[PDB]
Ligand SMILES: C#Cc1cccc(-n2nccc2-c2nn(-c3ccccc3)ccc2=O)c1
């Protein structure tokens with residue numbers, strides 16, 4: 093309990109900021125995550141030796157895909173960490189515990205394909221779960237790893253708290269189904285503007301947590317421009333592979349996923365910043381004002397994609 097994980101000076105400072113990049117050294121990502129749980133939750137909350145065993149089994153069940161990989165998991169976990177430190181008093185001891193775990197586990201065993209492709213390919217996981225196909229799979233994997241021996245990081249919670257925390261994680265992981273984002277923000281917008289939003293309503297917390305989870309999942313669009321620029325190549329590599337697999341079933345993919353239509357990427361990014369990211373971070377700042385820096389960084393990047401279309405910058 094007297095073994096405080098430290099980070100080098102530049103990391104120790106830069107890690108507190110929303111736009112932190114976790115860097116290219118895979119071997120430091122576990123220490124970074126533990127550093128974050130320790131400052132976010134306490135030295136007390138988790139048994140160091142169980143935690144480390146959990147993190148490495150989680151790492152082992154992420155796959156080598158261009159984007160939906162172990163780096164993504166830790167990135168998303170970091171954004172949640174930033175949100176929780178800048179909104180210190182709003183969240184319970186259990187939420188702080190489960191949300192950082194939820195973010196680490198949110199894309200467990202992803203193969204780089206959307207729910208749509210599972211449905212058209214007729215993947216057995218689509219028989220098992222008709223909506224949020226991958227997201228009920230990710231949660232299922234979380235529970236598997238939670239039930240390996242020496243892996244129950246939650247062993248000190250009562251029966252109650254254990255159910256509470258796994259129900260935070262489940263809901264938190266389902267909420268990363270972007271198809272659910274749209275209704276979830278339209279309802280929080282309406283609750284904030286008519287002043288009914290009330291954080292003592294457990295129904296309303298769930299929604300707020302779902303939006304944090306979209307916020308964290310999308311946070312590659314909230315980094316400094318050269319990190320956003322270089323992550324997009326990873327994002328489109330998965331999209332273009334999925335389009336190839338679509339063409340393989342005898343189906344024109346949407347252009348986003350057609351690697352013959354690379355020319356339309358920047359306009360496609362504009363669409364997505366306008367249609368998804370900017371609305372996500374607007375609504376999230378209205379509900380939690382200290383998250384503004386996510387909105388500020390998102391708009392800067394929108395403005396950098398505008399510059400790309402005007403040929404004042406190439407990609
Ligand atoms: C792979 C992937 C993937 C899946 C979930 C979110 C993100 N993500 N994160 C940051 C930016 C983006 C992003 N998402 N889309 C997107 C558009 C329509 C449906 C779904 C995703 C289009 C362009 C982007 O840049 C990527």
Ligand SMILES: [Mg+2]
Nearest residue numbers: 198199226268
């Ligand atoms: Mg996902």
Ligand SMILES: [Zn+2]
Nearest residue numbers: 198199268309
């Ligand atoms: Zn994700």
